[PDB]
Write a protein that binds this DNA or RNA. Structure first.
Ligand SMILES: Nc1ncnc2c1ncn2[C@@H]1O[C@@H]2COP(=O)(O)O[C@H]2[C@H]1O
Length: 201
DNA sequence: CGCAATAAATGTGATCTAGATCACATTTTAGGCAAAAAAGGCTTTACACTTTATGCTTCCGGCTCGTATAATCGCACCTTATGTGAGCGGATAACAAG
């Protein structure tokens, strides 16, 4: 449909792992779209602690905020998590496609609504719910993600002990303590990054 | 399955604050309602405006009249001296025709 009409003017260019698709400081002159794989977006402070806002899997767009208002810069950093195939379309030639077919814009701004609902309703849980409650909800949220692999016992995901604290809002030390505590009670499992939870499904 | 190497992620655990509890007595808070002090309200009376008829007076202003008067006339002295050519009508001399 409209999606196929979008790939007719794209520029196929594969990006290796640990690459740089979006550099905070450069000029936004290329729209990116995810075909296969996944990518992560995060920011940094003055020390070195990271902070992931939201994850973007396949079928999502990369850097679309610098399209509505011409003359902007890259907000956050976008590092390629895994081998992903991303297209390339200049914003200049994109604006001409909207004036002749606004329907194409109805697709991009359609995914910008869900990314706001999962963030606004998350703040409330990061002010009342304790560590046990915040992490508990996170386990189910990551299980609903398409990048999650089906497990005979439950769900198998791969996330570090830092990214967890960046979602529930806490220190990295606290995460490791509770994580190992649930292991003794036979509730979940962890072997570095891969965390297999139980009770799901 | 092990190997590569730049980035991100890992543990440590004693020290020292950061953030939270509770039930009851003290201290602050909010808008509430008249009173006082102020805004314009919309009265009714105190006075003050230039204006304009007038005519009477003195002072400054603006205009003429007639009168009185001599004249209807006479040297010697001081310092300069426009520029041209072009265009035009008129007066004069030389010429051919009758
Ligand atoms: N919380 C978020 N949810 C979804 N996408 C994001 C989030 N934060 C940053 N991004 C994307 O990261 C991109 C960084 O570059 P852009 O400003 O071009 O566009 C930004 C967004 O598209």
């Amino acid at each position: 449909p409209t999606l196929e009409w979008f790939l007719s003017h794209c520029h196929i260019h594969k990006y290796p792992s640990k690459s740089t698709l979006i550099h905070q400081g450069e000029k936004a002159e290329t729209l990116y779209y995810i075909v296969k794989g996944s990518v992560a977006v995060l920011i940094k402070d003055e020390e070195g602690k990271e902070m992931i806002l939201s994850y973007l899997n396949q079928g999502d767009f990369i850097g679309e905020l610098g399209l509505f208002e011409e003359g902007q810069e890259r907000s956050a950093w976008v590092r390629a998590k895994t081998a992903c195939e991303v297209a390339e379309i200049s914003y200049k030639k994109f604006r001409q496609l909207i004036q002749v077919n606004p329907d194409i814009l109805m697709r991009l701004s359609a995914q910008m609504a869900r990314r706001l609902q999962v963030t606004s309703e998350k703040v409330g849980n990061l002010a009342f719910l304790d560590v046990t409650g915040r992490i508990a909800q996170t386990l189910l949220n990551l299980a609903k993600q398409p990048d999650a692999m089906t497990h005979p016992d439950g769900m198998q995901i791969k996330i570090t002990r830092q990214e967890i604290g960046q979602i529930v809002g806490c220190s990295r030390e606290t995460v490791g303590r509770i994580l190992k505590m649930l292991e003794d009670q036979n509730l979940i499992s962890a072997h570095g990054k891969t965390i297999v939870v139980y009770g799901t499904r």
